[PDB]
Structure formats: structure tokens, C-alpha cells
Amino acid sequence: DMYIERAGDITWEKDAEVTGNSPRLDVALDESGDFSLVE
Amino acid sequence: GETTDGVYRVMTRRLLGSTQVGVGVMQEGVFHTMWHVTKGAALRSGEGRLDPYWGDVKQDLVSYCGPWKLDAAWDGLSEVQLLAVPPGERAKNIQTLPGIFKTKDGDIGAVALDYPAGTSGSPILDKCGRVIGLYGNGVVIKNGSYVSAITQGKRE
């Protein structure tokens, strides 16, 4: 059996760590729900 | 069981110790996660039981106790926060400007943040604290790094 445990509220937190880039990517979605890079 | 709104860990004892397989969102009495986390299996909350209500392997989404509740959308402009809940570490908000998944069916927001697979299902939020999608289905890029779709369901 899988079980759940609460980990926090869903809140925008002002002054949080800002990171990661913003790539534009060509992708295909298969019937199994797996994304892949179209090139 | 615990029905309180918020983000939750999804755990299994089927491996060594207790292992975090993913995360989800309780809203309006409904549990929302990604399909690859639970494979559609039922869940425990104390001595309470959560039964799947809705799912789709292609969307990679599943809802428990009721229909999909989360209907907010990325506006295509503003930054967002991954409320990341990694295995064995505290909930941590991480702010980012989404990139784009360009598909034959449409454009999707994507977040370029790398976390262990056990983080799948962590919500993505807008400036008003609304869930606009879930993190953990996406792609591995040129670099070897992971980019996730902002995966959102349809509310009926």
C-alpha cells in the first residue's frame, strides 16, 4: 500500500530562490504519455 | 483520513525502508497526482482509503475521491514557483520563468528544474497561489538536464 503524508501549504512565498532557464523545445507526446525531443 | 488542502508526499514500504515515489495536491477533498507515481493504485491516509476516480496515462494525471479540481493556467508571461517536495527534505518554493514545449497539438509551459524522480507531482503555482499544473513529466535536454511540462488537467 502507498500512503500520503502532508508536506506543507500551497502558498506563493515572496523572496524565494530564483533559478533555472526558459528553453523553447520541439517535443512529441506518445500514446504512453512519454515526451520526446523532435529535431 | 486527513482531507486538509495542501501538498503531500506519496510513500511506499514495497522497497527498502519507506521510499517517496512522488507528491500530490489535496484540494476540495480531491487528491491530484501524476499517473506514473501511483499507476492508478489506491492510497492510505491514516486508516482512511483514497480510491482513484479519474485518470489518463496520456495526460499522465490521476484524481482520488472526486473529479480533477485544478483549473488555473500559466498566463504565458509571468514567473511561477515549483513548490518542490523532494525525498527526505522540506517543501521548498523555487521561482522560475517557464520555457515552452512546442508540440503538433499546441504550446505547453515547461520548467527547467532538476530534482529526483520522487519529486514528480509537486505543484506549480501562480502569483495568487493557484495550482496551474504538476511537475514531473517531461524530457532530458542537450545538456543532460531535465525539463518538465506544466501538466494541467481539465475541470468539468
Ligand SMILES: Cc1nc(-c2ccc(C)c3ncccc23)c[nH]1
Ligand atoms: C520513470 C520516470 N521517471 C520520471 C521522472 C520524473 C521526474 C523527474 C524530476 C525525473 N528526473 C530524472 C529522470 C526521470 C524523472 C518520469 N518517468
